[PDB]
Structure 1
Amino acid sequence: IVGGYTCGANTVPYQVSLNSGYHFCGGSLINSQWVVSAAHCYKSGIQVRLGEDNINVVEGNEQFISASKSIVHPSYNSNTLNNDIMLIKLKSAASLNSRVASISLPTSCASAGTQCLISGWGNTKSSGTSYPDVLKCLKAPILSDSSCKSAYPGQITSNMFCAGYLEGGKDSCQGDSGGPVVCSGKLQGIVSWGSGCAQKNKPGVYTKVCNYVSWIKQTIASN
């Protein structure tokens, strides 16, 4: 997160950290056994870390659970980043509490202007790289599709939306990928991609979760 603020220990209870000897992506807990992340975050040997704040120090509320299965959307295209969503099943259910909770799936899509909370342990610099120890937050609005497509001619599909600031300075960045975009208590997006970070006229692009609600539910029901 570039130009954001320190969330505060466990203030984003649904935020998870995907770990493989180091933090490489974020994710969202949608129920006791399932996490939603980005398809391009996929890899083997994934350990899901819940109830995290400072990802480098054991503080007391962490729950480390191995992924028993990772389901990348069958129509995910790595060349266009279309359908950039993945479901991860935990080996055992997580113990839900005040510091570890699930986030609700949307029942309808969000509209332009809607204010959302984006979080992650991603890079905090627009120029160069420097990762934080604690979880970072950023409040950002969903932009109109016109502005989104004007910024990224020919690269925006109906399964993506832009959110952020055209003036630059505040944006999600590498390391935030797979993380949540919550609006009015609903997970509306997944950190996917963007041209650099916090760059002018280059807002972040996010996976439009509302288009995948049926797919998600039918998939977890079958696994």
Structure 2
Amino acid sequence: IVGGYTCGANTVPYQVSLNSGYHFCGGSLINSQWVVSAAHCYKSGIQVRLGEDNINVVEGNEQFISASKSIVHPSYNSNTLNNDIMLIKLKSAASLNSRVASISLPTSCASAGTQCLISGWGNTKSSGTSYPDVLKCLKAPILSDSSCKSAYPGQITSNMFCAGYLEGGKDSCQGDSGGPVVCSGKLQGIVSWGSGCAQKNKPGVYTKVCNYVSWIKQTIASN
């Protein structure tokens, strides 16, 4: 997260860290046994880390649970990042509490100007590499489709939206991928892609979760 603030330990209880010996992506807990992340975060050997604040210190409230299966959207395209969403099933059910809790899926899409919360342990610098120990937060609005498409002509599908600041300085970045975009208590996006981080006229691009609710529900019920 570039231009953000320290969230505060466990203030974002649905945030997860995907770990393979190091933090490489975020995700969101959507019930006690399933996490939603980005398809481009797929790899084998994932451990899901719940209840984290400092990702380098065991502080208490952590739960570490292996992934049993990761389900990349069958129509995910690595070239265009269309349908950049993946479901992860935990080997065992998480213990839900005030520090580890699920986030609701939306029943409708959010509109332009809606203010959302974005969170992650990604790079905090637009020039250079600076990863934080603790979780960072950013409030960002959903941009209009016209502005999104003007920023990235021909690259925006109906499964993507832009959020952020055209003046630059505030954005998600490398290591935030897969993490949540939460608006009015609902998961509306997943950190997917962008052009650099926090550069002018190049906002972040996010997977539009409201387009996938029926797919998520159908897939969880059959797995």
TM-score tier by shorter-chain length is over 0.9
State the shift of 1:90 in Å.
0.1
Question: What corresponds to 1:61 in structure 2?
Answer: 61
> How far apart, in 2, do the equivalents of 1:63 and 1:100 lie?
9
Alpha-carbon distance between aligned partners in 2 of 1:208 and 1:147, rounded to the nearest angstrom: 16
CA–CA separation in structure 1 for the residues paired with 2:174 and 2:191: 9
RMSD: 0.2
How far residue 87 of structure 1 moved from its aligned partner, in angstroms, is: 0.0
Q: Partners of 1:96 and 1:114 in 2: how far apart?
A: 28
Indicate the SS of the match to 1:52: coil
Instruction: Report the CA distance between 1:163 and its aligned residue.
Output: 0.1
- Cα deviation for residue 108 of structure 1 reads 0.2
In structure 2, what is the Cα distance between the partners aligned to 1:129 and 1:186?
31
- 1:168 aligns to what? 168
Displacement of 1:30 after TM fit? 0.1
Alpha-carbon distance between aligned partners in 2 of 1:90 and 1:158, rounded to the nearest angstrom: 30
For residues 100-128 of structure 1, what are the alpha-carbon distances to aligned partners after superposition, in whole Å with 9 as ceiling and x for unaligned?
00000000000000000000000000001
Gaps in structure 1 of 5+ consecutive residues = none
Q: Deviations over 1:187-223 (max 9, x none)?
A: 0000000000000000000000000000000000000
| d(CA) in 2 for partners of 1:157, 1:173 | 21
Q: What secondary structure sits across from 2:202 in the alignment?
A: coil
The alpha-carbon deviation at position 141 of structure 1 amounts to: 0.1
Deviations along 1:8-48, whole A, 9 cap, x unmatched?
A: 00000000000000000000000000000000000000000
TM-score, normalised with respect to structure 1 = 1.00
Pairing of 1:53-132 with structure 2 (within 5 A): 53-132=53-132
C-alpha distance in 2 between matches for 1:56 and 1:46: 17
Partner Cα distance (1:166, 1:41) in 2: 26
Moved over 3 A (4+): none
**Cα deviation, residue 75, structure 1:** 0.0
Q: Give me the TM-score of the superposition, normalised by structure 2.
A: 1.00
Could you list the per-position Cα deviations for residues 154-182 of structure 1 after superposition, in whole angstroms to 9, with x for gaps in the alignment? 00000000000000000000100000000
Q: Secondary structure at the match of 1:149?
A: helix
Q: What CA distance in whole angstroms lies between the structure 1 residues aligned with 2:113 and 2:3?
A: 19
Output the CA distance in 2 between the equivalents of 1:129 and 1:104: 33
What is the match of residue 180 of structure 1?
180
Q: Report the 3-state secondary structure (helix = DSSP H, G, I; strand = E; otherwise coil) of the residue aligned with 1:212.
A: helix
Map Cα deviations across residues 126-150 of structure 1 (whole Å, 9 max, x no partner).
0011100000000000000000000
Percent identity at matched positions? 100
| Paired positions, count | 223
After TM superposition, give the deviation of residue 57 of structure 1 in Å: 0.1
Residue 12 of structure 2 is aligned to residue 12 of structure 1: yes
Q: Deviations over 1:46-65 (max 9, x none)?
A: 00000000000000010000
Distance 2:68 2:27 in 1: 15
Report the Cα distance in structure 1 between the residues aligned to 2:130 and 2:40, rounded to whole angstroms. 21
Q: Please give the alpha-carbon distance, in whole angstroms, between the structure 2 residues aligned to 1:215 and 1:168.
A: 34
1:181 is paired with a residue whose SS is strand
Q: Which runs of 5+ in 2 are unaligned?
A: none
